[PDB]
């Protein structure tokens, strides 16, 4: 209901023994879940806030060399020191100059010279680390009550926030029972090696190991108003002209430099604390306490009119908005599907048992008709309704699209991708272990290698497999090559 025609949402059906279904909740997308008898529900993750941050290694992306000083010494007289050398704010190096009788030194040759300067910092870019104590996720569960204002609505639902301390949570529903969540945030995204970087009004997440190797001055991040910057030499640059004197420049500001650098990073909009979007999290749905809500209700007999025309989504789902006529009883609208000239019921009703709670407000009934011609019946009377609809897709096309979606999910979620629709079974566990070993090997072997290099290595490996007589090696390397092509094509998204 919340998830209708948004971010290639899928529907994971089936329940294990004792009715736990495992689901990984990709952020920026969502899932829906039908059941044997329990009402269907859709879950979407959003607003993984992270609060109570800590600041360390604030860098500096600009300079202002205010005071400049110099000193010289005659050749073969040692290196000329400068009194402004031992302060915690001056950076300089020694260079050699040629001195003569025209410069005040009797001995001809090469002499020492220094040029030291104070280094004010401007526009610091503080680096913030996040700790798991204060992290908070938020998942919104919506039931398919078929309300008038329920389709594609981001507001309706019940928030069930989860924290790495209190992993378990039971979401209370309005007269539906309780839903049991056992999501695990200590896996999925790992913020131990991910550091939030905030500059100006924008923020980012960069891998920690990469956040100390980018060359810029850095400081303790104690915001004590007088930061003594480590490695000041990197930003300021000395130029020595053809022999003679020596002068110092500022090398401008690194704003666009940093903006260019953070190509592969994600975006985290921080207004109050931080609101990390583009998340990822695995969940478990303990679905025991889901009332069908329509056991006692009866199939009413009055006629039905529809407000808007029949419409479908990207997937095999049609959304029907029907209205009830003049009978006061809140009933259980029946449903059936028919063929062209024959009578065969095949169209699955994707939602729960639709119920008209009130006479005035319509109900949004959505379902999955079969491929080809479809006829829809919305009552027991002869004149209830007739909705004829033609679906375009084909079974092989649906299987191909499902495999494409599965491969896409595997590319991003990697080793945990098997857990997405996983129902407790040995084969899923075996594939999980095998793919986890292979993924560790692959990510370890390809770390930081970019997409163009991935595609080049893949095509080269495919060729080296196409011209070999060692059959087992040929097939192993060709499989690795094809996987490499696919990962290179899919990466960056």
């Amino acid at each position, epitope marked *: 209901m919340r998830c209708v025609g948004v971010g290639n949402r899928d529907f994971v059906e089936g329940l294990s023994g004792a009715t736990w279904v495992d689901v990984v909740l990709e952020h920026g997308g969502c899932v829906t879940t039908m059941a044997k008898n329990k009402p269907t529900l859709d879950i979407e993750l959003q607003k993984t806030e992270a609060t109570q941050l800590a600041t360390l290694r604030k860098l500096c992306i*600009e300079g202002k060399i205010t005071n400049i000083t110099t000193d010289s010494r005659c050749p073969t007289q040692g290196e000329a020191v400068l009194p402004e050398e031992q302060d915690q704010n001056y950076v300089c190096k020694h260079t050699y100059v040629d001195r003569g009788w025209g410069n005040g030194c009797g001995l001809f040759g090469k002499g020492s010279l220094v040029t030291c300067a104070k280094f004010q910092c*401007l*526009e610091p870019i503080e680096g913030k680390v996040v700790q798991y104590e204060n992290l908070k996720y938020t998942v919104i569960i919506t039931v398919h009550t078929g309300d008038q204002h329920q389709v594609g609505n981001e507001t309706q639902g019940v928030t069930a926030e989860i924290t790495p301390q209190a992993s378990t949570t039971e979401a209370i529903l309005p007269e539906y029972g309780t839903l049991g969540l056992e999501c695990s945030p200590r896996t999925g995204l790992d913020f131990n090696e991910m550091i939030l970087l905030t500059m*100006k*009004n924008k923020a980012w997440m960069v891998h920690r190991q990469w956040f100390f190797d980018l060359p810029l001055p850095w400081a303790s991040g104690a915001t004590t108003e007088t930061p003594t910057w480590n490695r000041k030499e990197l930003l300021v640059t000395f130029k020595n002209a053809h022999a003679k004197k020596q002068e110092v420049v500022v090398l401008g500001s690194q704003e666009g430099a940093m903006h260019t650098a953070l190509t592969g990073a994600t975006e985290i909009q*921080n*207004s*109050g604390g931080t609101s990390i979007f583009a998340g990822h999290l695995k969940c478990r749905l303990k679905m025991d306490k889901l009332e069908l809500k329509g056991m006692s209700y009866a199939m009413c007999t009055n006629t039905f009119v529809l407000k808007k025309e029949v419409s479908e989504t990207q997937h095999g789902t049609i959304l029907i908005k029907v209205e009830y006529k003049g009978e006061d009883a809140p009933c259980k609208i029946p449903f059936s599907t028919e063929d062209g000239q024959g009578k065969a019921h095949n169209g699955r009703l994707i939602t729960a048992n639709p119920v008209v709670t009130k006479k005035e407000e319509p109900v949004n009934i959505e379902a999955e008709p079969p491929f080809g011609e479809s006829n829809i019946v919305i009552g027991i009377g002869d004149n209830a309704l007739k909705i004829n609809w033609y679906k375009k897709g084909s079974s092989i096309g649906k299987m191909f699209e499902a495999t494409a979606r599965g491969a896409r999910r595997m590319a991003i979620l990697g080793d945990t991708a098997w857990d997405f629709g996983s129902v407790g079974g040995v084969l899923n566990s075996l594939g999980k272990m095998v793919h986890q070993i292979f993924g560790s090997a692959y990510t370890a072997l390809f770390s930081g290698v970019s997409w163009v290099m991935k595609i080049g290595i893949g095509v080269l490996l495919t060729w080296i497999g196409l011209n070999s007589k060692n059959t087992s090696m040929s097939f192993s390397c060709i499989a690795i090559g094809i996987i490499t092509l696919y990962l290179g094509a899919v990466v960056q998204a």
Partner: antibody, heavy 122, light 109 residues
Framework: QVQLVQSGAEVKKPGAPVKVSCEASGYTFTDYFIHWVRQAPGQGLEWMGWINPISGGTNYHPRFHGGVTMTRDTSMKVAYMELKRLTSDDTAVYFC???????????????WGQGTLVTVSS | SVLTQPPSASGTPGQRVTISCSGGSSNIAINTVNWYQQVPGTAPKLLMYSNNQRPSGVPDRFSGSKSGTSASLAISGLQSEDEADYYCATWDDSLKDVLFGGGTKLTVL
């Protein structure tokens, strides 16, 4: 000392361009900013745009791009602003102020002039 | 966003009155606020050339800072000669322009 003469107030008719000259001597003009803040009678003053004398271009307030133009000269250390179109709205005194290039100093308007006044009528 | 500060009244006996400046998450919550007071009809002078640093304004009685999305100014021992309109201006970094406020009509009895 450092100051801005801002010439003298002049008033004109709608549909013609008016000029407001603004000279600041006494210091190296190149490094610092000129901000050109407008102030209406009995209303708050809003800033429009910088001009870097050495290499700067116009960076007007979003309300005023294509409504005003800013020029300058380095030899005489003067910044020129002119109104390409006078409607009935712009009936106010236009100012000058020295600004720093610091990120925290973009609003640093330390020194101001007298304020050249222009009003429009028939 | 945009900043809006309220006009208010006060009296000539010394008392702490707070000129609060309210902004957003991109204009004043990260940048240095600037406080101006203008004697009416002439060129406004600058009252605070940093977040809490005054260049030459009336010392020891004009001091204030900012908290999160809000910036404030505090005046002590306010007499009649301090009749002025007080302005808070912050640099907006999203829109690449400074954000001046509407203005406070601080009248002192």
């Amino acid at each position: 000392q450092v100051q801005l003469v801002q010439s003298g107030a002049e008033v004109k008719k709608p549909g013609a361009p008016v000029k407001v000259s603004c000279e600041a001597s006494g210091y190296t003009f190149t490094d610092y900013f000129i901000h050109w803040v407008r102030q209406a009678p009995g209303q708050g003053l809003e800033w429009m745009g910088w001009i870097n004398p050495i290499s700067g271009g116009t960076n007007y307030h979003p309300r005023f791009h294509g409504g005003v133009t800013m020029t300058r000269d380095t030899s005489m250390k003067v910044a020129y602003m002119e109104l390409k179109r006078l409607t009935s709205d712009d009936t106010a005194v236009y100012f000058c102020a020295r600004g720093r290039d610091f990120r925290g100093g973009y609003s640093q308007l330390d020194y101001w002039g007298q304020g050249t006044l222009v009003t429009v009528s028939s | 966003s945009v900043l809006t500060q309220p006009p208010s009244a006060s009296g000539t006996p010394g008392q702490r009155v707070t000129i609060s400046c309210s902004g957003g998450s991109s204009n004043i919550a990260i940048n240095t606020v600037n406080w101006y007071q203008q004697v009416p009809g002439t060129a406004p002078k600058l009252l605070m050339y940093s977040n809490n640093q005054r260049p030459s304004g009336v010392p020891d009685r004009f001091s204030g800072s900012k908290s999160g999305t809000s910036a404030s100014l505090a005046i002590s021992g306010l007499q009649s000669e301090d009749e002025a309109d007080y302005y808070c201006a912050t640099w907006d970094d999203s829109l690449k322009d400074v954000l001046f406020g509407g203005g406070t009509k601080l009248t002192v009895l």
